Amino acid sequence: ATILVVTGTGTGVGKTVVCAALASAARQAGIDVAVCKPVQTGTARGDDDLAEVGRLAGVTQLAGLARYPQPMAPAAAAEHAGMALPARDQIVRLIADLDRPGRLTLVEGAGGLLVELAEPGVTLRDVAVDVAAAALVVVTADLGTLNHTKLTLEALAAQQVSCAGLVIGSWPDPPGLVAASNRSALARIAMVRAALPAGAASLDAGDFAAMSAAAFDRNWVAGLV
Amino acid sequence: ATILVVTGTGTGVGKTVVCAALASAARQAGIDVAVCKPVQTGTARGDDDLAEVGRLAGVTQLAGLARYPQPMAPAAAAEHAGMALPARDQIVRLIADLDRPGRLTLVEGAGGLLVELAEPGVTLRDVAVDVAAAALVVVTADLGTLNHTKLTLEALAAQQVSCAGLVIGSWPDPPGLVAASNRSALARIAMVRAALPAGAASLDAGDFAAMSAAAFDRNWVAGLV
Ligand SMILES: Nc1ccn([C@@H]2O[C@H](COP(=O)(O)OP(=O)(O)OP(=O)(O)O)[C@@H](O)[C@H]2O)c(=O)n1
């Protein structure tokens, strides 16, 4: 029963595409995969990350909980719809019901690691502690990422949430000086599990699966479960 | 003899314009101001943060140690240039020498809080501990700012660096739903000392002075030294 929380250094760094990529790689290794989005904001703009994982990677086991119309931080999105945040134990139950031996359960947060998912001040990091997940950290290759990554990793070690590694969510072609350097530096901060090529979401079923299996070290993925 | 480290939740949050705006407000309160930027990068395209502070706020005690031509993070810019960052001792004693009774000494980093500034691995945080400065955190008003701010505040707390407060480096006009929510939300996390209007960096000195004197609570400024 392997639970893996998929966080990121920010909003829009590619958490969702990494989830699909990692799900795809794992399924291609015969590993059962469930993906879980406990807090989904922006549904009124049409955002639905579970649907994107499904479309991209063919995952059928998709689990949602809270959905808010506005594209905001959950607390703001909720209060705008006159809705409340889910309870901490509500989020943990969701993940727990998905968890089982042999299965890789991916939990994609909302935005970065310390976004509030439940009141008071409950975040993905607290959730990680409760389900004993490790955390996969999705990062950009852009200027500013080293700080953001170091901050997120520190935040994680602060509650002894293991770090499963880094994934560069979007990797330009060709990479510029700044992108190249940041990769080398990021790799020194932590294990870089993969660097997904820019625009991977434009790929069709096969192209995505092909990309995904190329992207991750097969021994790492096999060894997740 | 007040030293104040000015740091940001990322690149381009407006650290420089906040240094200048506080320096300006402080001067108009009768306080002597020094700004220190020990490492300046991106000189090949004219990046000169100290000069901006000079033009906007009229500060004259503007001190620096290193100028790397590449628009990168110091350590990377240095390695591209084939020359080490300055030694830890250089930065701390520069700041220490700037410091004097009756004076506000602002120290501006390069990017975010855990960016390496000196050899070896010395960050702006280590510097703040060494010179016993409080830390002023420049933030955005954009989606993602709550996470970035909380990560930065946590990192500051983990080494017992006090937080002088937050400043939104660029307040949009009109604000829009996210920015309006975030300004309230940042105030729930830490004191919001000021929110500088978008575009303030293009102001001439006189206009910048007037904006600055309105941007901060005068008592807080007065009580800084
Ligand atoms: N290798 C990649 C990485 C990202 N994307 C695109 O870039 C955007 C950002 O990716 P996403 O996974 O949605 O970002 P998240 O980190 O998941 O942002 P959020 O917090 O809103 O879920 C998406 O439209 C996605 O299709 C892409 O084309 N290919």
Provide a descriptive summary of the structure in words.
Two copies of one chain form a homodimer. Chain A has helices at residues 15-27, 49-57, 74-80, 88-98, 124-131, 145-157, 177-189, 205-215, 218-222, and strands spanning 2-8, 32-40, 61-67, 103-108, 134-139, 163-171, 192-197. With 225 residues, chain A is of the alpha/beta class. Chain A has nine helices and seven strands. Chain A has a single domain (1-225), classed as Rossmann fold (3-Layer(aba) Sandwich), CATH 3.40.50.300. In chain A, helix 1 packs parallel to helix 2, helix 4 (88-98) crosses helix 5 (124-131) and helix 6 runs parallel beside helix 7 (177-189). In chain A, strands 3-2-4-1-5-6-7 form a seven-stranded parallel sheet, with helices on both faces. The radius of gyration of chain A is 16 Å and the shape is globular. Chains A and B meet through helix 3, helix 6 and helix 7 of A and helix 3, helix 6 and helix 7 of B. The complex binds cytidine-5'-triphosphate. Cytidine-5'-triphosphate (CTP) is lined by residues 8, 11-17, 49, 110-111, 169-170, 196-201 of chain A. Chains A, B: It is an enzyme of class 6 (ligase). Chains A, B: Its main location: cytoplasm. Chains A, B: It catalyses: (7R,8S)-7,8-diammoniononanoate + CO2 + ATP = (4R,5S)-dethiobiotin + ADP + phosphate + 3 H(+). Chains A, B: Substrate binds at residue 41. Chains A, B: It comes from Mycobacterium tuberculosis (strain ATCC 25177 / H37Ra). The PDB classes it as ligase.
